[PDB]
Amino acid sequence: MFVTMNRIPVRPEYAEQFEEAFRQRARLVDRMPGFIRNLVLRPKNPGDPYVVMTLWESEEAFRAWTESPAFKEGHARSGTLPKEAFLGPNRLEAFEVVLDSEG
């Protein structure tokens, strides 16, 4: 299982719009081959970034997704969010799951 964490430093003033916009992105990724789960995570402290965490069957499944028309439409999101909404660029992290309490 392959996981991405997209750290998005959205200002608290725009948190609701960000969430509303990202609800749509989760919709477009649902039918995606190898998609497992998406979570949007609000930070305890508003000065820290949101995390969009996405679970995939494999890195390859993620790569296919990045090249898809669904991904491009999903990005029509913070297309609508002004540049000013963010403190900085997003920071994308990626991982392989080494232990999972589930089965």
Next chain:
Amino acid sequence: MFVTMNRIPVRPEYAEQFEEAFRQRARLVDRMPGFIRNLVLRPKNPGDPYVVMTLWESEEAFRAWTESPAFKEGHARSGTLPKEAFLGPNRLEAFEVVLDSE
């Protein structure tokens, strides 16, 4: 749902020791009230930190956990086991789940 992520900047030479030691104690949390799931995530770049991610029914369930005998007992069979194998300190980030495809 409440999520913690503990970012562990283990050096690559000690990553195998970290993983295997965490495995030894990872089960201690399972019986805890409000525990949902735990994942240990290895970075794609060995220069980046591991993330230990845990899903909780509430923030108070997490907090109660950190007081438990099982937490103290487990943070000796991994919290002590590896030497100084780190680029710096752990960094705990906490979150509320606001969207879940599940």
